[PDB]
Amino acid sequence: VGSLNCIVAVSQNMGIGKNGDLPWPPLRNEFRYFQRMTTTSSVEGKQNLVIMGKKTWFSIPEKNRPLKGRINLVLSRELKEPPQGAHFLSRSLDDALKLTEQPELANKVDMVWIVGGSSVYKEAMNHPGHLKLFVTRIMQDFESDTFFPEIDLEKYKLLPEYPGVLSDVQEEKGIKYKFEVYEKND
Ligand SMILES: NC(=O)C1=CN([C@@H]2O[C@H](COP(=O)(O)OP(=O)(O)OC[C@H]3O[C@@H](n4cnc5c(N)ncnc54)[C@H](OP(=O)(O)O)[C@@H]3O)[C@@H](O)[C@H]2O)C=CC1
Ligand SMILES: COc1cc(Cc2cnc(N)nc2N)cc(OC)c1OC
Incomplete structure (x- = not known):
């Protein structure tokens, strides 16, 4: 796999979770952006992997698990089989990417999306090679108990724009936010 993508939404105080859910109220178009980015593949015969x-x-609602139209892979050191409804289980990120090269997934995976949590993001951001970070900046502080690791600007560049990503400040339910894309190359 020659490239990874991470996708996250983060408050001004770098919060990403509180009590097993989001720190802010549900933002419907923000969620629709997460679903579009992680699900869309124009390559016939393939699906994206989350x-x-x-x-x-x-933390995902039972009725929404697995994420539809995507191959769902959970990381765990303790499980022996995927949680109920998930498709695959791996002991680490390196192992997950290697799994995509084996027969079952060989002709099946398009893009790879890391969707959390903290430790998974941290590991992904230091993975060698090309990597993009799709970061939604929620422009307020929210009480949080789980945080996004610091973006190393020695490695990552904020892109001025990206095809298919809106550049202006957004607002839903009175909460302002903006979509950012960062890239590193190694
Ligand atoms: N705002 C946002 O964009 C998002 C927010 N969230 C929020 O974040 C919180 C959940 O995230 P968080 O608490 O950080 O936990 P994680 O989702 O990272 O889950 C932790 C568990 O996952 C397994 N795990 C994590 N990394 C690895 C690894 N490298 N190799 C093998 N197993 C691994 C371990 O399971 P085991 O102990 O079985 O080995 C570990 O105990 C929730 O509040 C959720 O709502 C989540 C995603 C995005
Ligand atoms: C892991 O799956 C989900 C993750 C999120 C958090 C999230 C929300 N927005 C963005 N841009 N990235 C994210 N990772 C939000 C979700 O719905 C509100 C999810 O489905 C239940």
Whole structure:
């Protein structure tokens, strides 16, 4: 796999979670952006793969699990089989990417999306090679108990624009936010 993508939404105080859910109220178009980015593939015969930690998996509503139209892979050191409804289980990120090269997934995976949590993001951001970070900046402070690791600007560049990503400040339910894309190359 020659490229990874991470996708996250983060408050001004770098918060990404509180009590097993988002720190802010549900933002419907922001969620629709997450669903569009992670689901869309124009390559016939292939699907995107989403990779997440176990707490993030259990943070998804049961009726929405697995994420539809995507291959769902959970990372866990303790499980022996995927949680109920998930497609694959791997002991680490390196192992997950290697799994995509094996027969079952060989002709099947287009893009790879890391969708949390903290430790998964941290590991992905230091992975060698090309990597993009799709970061939604929620432009307020929210009480949080889980945080996004610092973006190393020695490695990552904020892109001035990106095709298919809106550049202006957005607003839903009185909360302002903006979509950012960062890239590193190694
Ligand atoms: N705002 C946002 O964009 C998002 C927010 N969230 C929020 O974040 C919180 C969940 O995230 P968080 O608490 O950080 O937990 P994680 O989703 O990272 O889950 C932690 C568990 O996942 C497994 N795991 C994590 N990394 C690895 C690894 N490298 N290799 C093997 N297993 C691994 C371990 O399971 P085990 O112990 O079984 O080995 C670990 O105990 C929730 O509040 C959720 O709502 C989540 C995603 C995005
Ligand atoms: C892991 O799956 C989900 C993750 C999120 C958090 C999230 C929300 N927005 C963006 N841009 N990235 C994210 N990772 C939000 C969700 O819905 C509100 C999810 O589905 C239940």
